[PDB]
């Protein structure tokens, strides 16, 4: 009877991590966001093949910024390239405090959860990372 719907440990590839570090680093002190594209297989592994940023937020990681329209637009293109991948989750940077979401950001996070349960939220701190896994 019960289902799964658990957060599995996220396997981040080498290119995707670099894209997150680079996105954040330019992006801060301004709160910024972008999407994570990958494939999820099994019920243990989600692999984050690639990311790209879907238009960066202003003040807060605003609910205005989450856009199904941009998400839809980008997704059909991928199909034509012959790399169709699904949104595995999304990432955002906070320089405010390490590993923290803003108030606005939790509301924004909920739109992604409705789309897929395996939507994850990654907080990147470029200010406080000098090993870049930290």
């Amino acid at each position: 009877a019960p289902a799964v719907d658990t957060a599995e440990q996220v396997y981040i590839s080498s290119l995707a991590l670099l894209k997150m570090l680079k996105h954040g680093r330019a992006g801060v002190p301004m709160e910024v966001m972008g999407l994570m594209l990958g494939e999820f297989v099994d019920d243990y592994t989600v692999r984050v093949i690639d990311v790209f940023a879907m238009p960066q937020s202003g003040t807060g990681v605003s609910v205005e910024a989450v856009d199904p329209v941009f998400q839809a637009k980008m997704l059909d293109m991928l199909k034509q390239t012959g790399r169709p991948e699904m949104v595995v989750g999304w990432y955002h940077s906070h320089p405010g405090f390490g590993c923290w979401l803003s108030g606005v950001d939790i509301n924004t996070q909920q739109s992604f959860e409705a789309l897929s349960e395996r939507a994850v939220a990654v907080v990147v701190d470029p200010i406080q990372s000098v090993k870049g896994k930290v």
Binding site: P29, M30, E31, G58, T59
Partner: protein, 73 residues
């Protein structure tokens, strides 16, 4: 342009926007105390001082055209 209020972005400091010029209402209220008029009929005393003053301010404002023609300040 100078004297114009502007919006600056809070997150990263750049000038994002513009806002109306500020004026002051307090100055407008202060203005025009010419009514009631004072004339020289409830203000006075010191006959010579009043005459020189009329010569220095009052007459050159009416008689302005002449000064320009003559070339004299």
């Amino acid at each position: 342009k100078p004297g114009d209020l502007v919006g600056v972005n809070k997150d990263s400091y750049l000038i994002l926007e513009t806002l109306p010029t500020e004026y002051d209402s307090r100055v407008k209220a202060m203005e025009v105390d010419e009514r009631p008029t004072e004339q020289y009929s409830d203000i006075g005393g010191l006959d010579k001082q009043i005459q020189e003053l009329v010569e220095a301010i009052v007459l050159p404002m009416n008689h302005k055209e002449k000064f320009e023609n003559l070339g004299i300040q």
